[PDB]
Design a protein around this ligand. Structure first.
Ligand SMILES: [Mg+2]
Ligand SMILES: [Mg+2]
Ligand SMILES: [Mg+2]
Ligand SMILES: [Mg+2]
Ligand SMILES: [Mg+2]
Ligand SMILES: [Mg+2]
Ligand SMILES: [Mg+2]
Ligand SMILES: [Mg+2]
Ligand SMILES: [Mg+2]
Ligand SMILES: [Mg+2]
Ligand SMILES: [Mg+2]
Ligand SMILES: [Mg+2]
Ligand SMILES: [Mg+2]
Ligand SMILES: [Mg+2]
Ligand SMILES: [Mg+2]
Ligand SMILES: [Mg+2]
Ligand SMILES: [Mg+2]
Ligand SMILES: [Mg+2]
Ligand SMILES: [Mg+2]
Ligand SMILES: [Mg+2]
Ligand SMILES: [Mg+2]
Ligand SMILES: [Mg+2]
Ligand SMILES: [Mg+2]
Ligand SMILES: [Mg+2]
Lengths: 50, 77
RNA sequence: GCUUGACUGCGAGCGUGACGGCGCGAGCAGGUGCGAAAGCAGGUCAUAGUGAUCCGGUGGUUCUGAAUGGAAGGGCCAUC
RNA sequence: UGAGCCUUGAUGGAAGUGUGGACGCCAGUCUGCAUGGCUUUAAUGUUUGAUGUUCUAACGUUGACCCGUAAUCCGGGUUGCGGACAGUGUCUGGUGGGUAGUUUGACUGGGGCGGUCU
RNA sequence: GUUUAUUAAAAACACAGCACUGUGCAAACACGAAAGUGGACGUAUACGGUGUGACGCCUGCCCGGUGCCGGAAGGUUAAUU
RNA sequence: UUUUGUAUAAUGGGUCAGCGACUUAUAUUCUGUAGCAAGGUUAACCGAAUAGGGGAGCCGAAGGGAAACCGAGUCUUAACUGGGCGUUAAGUUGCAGGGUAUAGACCCGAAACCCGGUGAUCUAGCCAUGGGCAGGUUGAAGGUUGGGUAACACUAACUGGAGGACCGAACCGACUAAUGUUGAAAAAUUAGCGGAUGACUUGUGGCUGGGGGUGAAAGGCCAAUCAAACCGGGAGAUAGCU
RNA sequence: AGGGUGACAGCCCCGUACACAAAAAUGCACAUGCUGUGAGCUCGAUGAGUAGGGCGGGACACGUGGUAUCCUGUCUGAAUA
RNA sequence: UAAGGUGAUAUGAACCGUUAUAACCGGCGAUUUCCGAAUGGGGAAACCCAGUGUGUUUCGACACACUAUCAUUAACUGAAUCCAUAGGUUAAUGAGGCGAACCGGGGGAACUGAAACAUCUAAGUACCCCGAGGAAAAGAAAUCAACCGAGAUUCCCCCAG
């Protein structure tokens, strides 16, 4: 569960980095709260074009 | 029923075995939980009775796919 | 007094057991001790001092080695 | 607050005024304070345990209100409470006549008790 | 008062009274793989369990054993790593 | 029949008739017999279907050694004067029979264990809704009025009508006896007996299920069955016993 | 073949061998109509919470045994010609 | 197809037929009360009661038809919440129940054997359950082989107790 960010956020905030977050942190808060999204190897290209 | 809506995991029967190998019937049943999942693609939460792994699948494949299944298969949800 | 025959491989022929087994044994081969030598010694004057098989340990062993080389595992010999 | 690599520690403008500490068997008129032609003595960034506080966002709610709905079921919703606990799955040490399956020798001047068993 | 319908009606069981003990409520506890239900539309003057058995006068010593309650030290100790 | 031994007063049989217990299949070995012979024979299958085809294969002609391997020898040991097992006699396939193996394996018989069902029309307890208790006693609290107290206390009458209270029918029980015991009855009859406004008794209907129910507790009751109900099943359980 | 007929029937009866028969409805084959369906060439693509592993069981003749292999309740988790 | 028929116990009555509408046999139709999956609601099976539609030169009350549930699809409707969902009505399809074995799947005993008994056996048997077909299942190598080769699955005989 690496995911890519969206806004700032915690000791990793950056509007679009590849972090390595704990899954529960990921698929219970950030994504449902729209602060990140999974890095599904398709996603590692849209925020790897900027 | 204790069936994982994602994997179809259900209880399975096996044995106990003592140090003397006495067999006593028993069941392994799955690590169910039931969990509010955000879809966004429907602006709603859906509670699936899900196994861990069921979760780990949803993590990987991603919800909507999994939801294509279930619906593809007829699961209520 | 000197010593390691309480030796290794074998064993004509016998005794004794329902059987598993146990016992006695000259002699042959190799190597050894004591004796000047003929000789004697394969434990103790003899008859009690004991535990099948299985499972497993150890040492040895080119005997076996699931395509082939090895290895695991097995066998055999010794022993627990 | 345990512990590695990066990091805040060390290694294969001269000389003047010169004063506590050094695991220093058993106390260096020597160095710095303003000025002068790829580590133990411990601590900033981390990947990682133990404990304690705080938070909400999984999870609980056999509080309250709302709708389905004239419904003490269920669900959805709002909210208060609880909160990474509780509970559950797999694994695991303890306990476990609550429950189950069984064992508990033979001889013998009946059997038991005694004695005996090579 | 109750009991062995059909060889035992009693000194047995029950009883009110007594004591210990559990239980803060989503109670302990019981039926139940579970949902749930009883306990109770009760809440410690309540409820379960256990022993004793109206009343009167009373109920002494022993915690070494077994059990239970308490015990943030230390020794030994599972999966795991 | 069983026994050391039975007229035995030890078993079994009232009598007759019918039925009633060593089978079947597949393996293996021996005997007989048949075929062929250092060879014998095919299995499935094909099939002009008991033929014919099919020799996959099985047995035998070589043994010894754990084995590699060697071979009329081989193993043992450094090696046998040796020793162990072998070298000399024929095998094989049918058919009939004797044994054995696997099967219910000669026939009948348990007490039980497991599985799925059917039972609270009896009885136990509980839930709901309806019914019953002739007649006669006792006289609790309370009340009233006099007496009595400073007022209460207290006291006498009268009134009142309490109780798992009293005597006693219906009703509910079941202490004694006799009768009955192939009964009138698989628990009653007769004479006595207990309770009889209560933890009473009763009609209807409901709920609880088998290691489960229910139990004022006897292991009681759960349909004349109870230290684990009944029906069907595993099932021909197993029976070193009769 | 067989049955029947007053007892045992090739020739009494009903059959049997043999040869024939379908107005209608149907099984089965083909042949087409209608519906639904896709064929073909070029260039591509090649099955991840999976394989494997840890724990627990189960399957493989194989009882964990030196035990390959298969399945998975549980926690994990690749390479990609 | 036909000279005889109106099933049997089963006579009798009254009939019907003989050259083709007697009977009898076959194909296809028609009718087909009530209960039963039972399906309009209920229910002590074969009974009680409805809503709505139809129906009467005697247009009342009765008779008939339809109205179960679930699934899929559509349409129309439509909360908390405006969107949107859940919810609700209608409609079209299909399902439901029964049935001998064979078949695949979810569960799964004990007696018994071991001369006792735990491992082991009985045995993945008996039994319960779900599902399907005319057969089921299995199947087009991440299979064997052993350096030579074979070439999906299934069944039979060997290999071999
Ligand atoms: Mg290999
Ligand atoms: Mg026991
Ligand atoms: Mg037993
Ligand atoms: Mg004895
Ligand atoms: Mg009695
Ligand atoms: Mg009595
Ligand atoms: Mg108390
Ligand atoms: Mg007493
Ligand atoms: Mg006698
Ligand atoms: Mg005799
Ligand atoms: Mg005589
Ligand atoms: Mg006589
Ligand atoms: Mg006699
Ligand atoms: Mg009753
Ligand atoms: Mg009385
Ligand atoms: Mg009386
Ligand atoms: Mg009875
Ligand atoms: Mg029997
Ligand atoms: Mg049996
Ligand atoms: Mg592929
Ligand atoms: Mg009806
Ligand atoms: Mg109905
Ligand atoms: Mg036994
Ligand atoms: Mg090749």
């Amino acid at each position: 569960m690496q995911v890519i960010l969206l806004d700032k956020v915690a000791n990793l905030g950056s509007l679009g980095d590849q972090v390595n977050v704990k899954a529960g942190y990921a698929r219970n808060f950030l994504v449902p709260q729209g602060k990140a999204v999974p890095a599904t190897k398709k996603n590692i290209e849209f925020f790897e074009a900027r | 029923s204790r069936v994982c809506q994602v994997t179809g995991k259900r209880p399975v029967t096996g044995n106990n075995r003592s140090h003397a190998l006495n067999a006593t019937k028993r069941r392994f049943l799955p690590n169910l939980h039931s969990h509010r999942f955000w879809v966004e693609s429907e602006k709603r939460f859906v509670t699936l009775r899900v196994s861990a792994k069921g979760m780990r699948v949803i993590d990987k494949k991603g919800i909507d796919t999994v939801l294509a299944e279930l619906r593809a298969r007829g699961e209520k949800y």
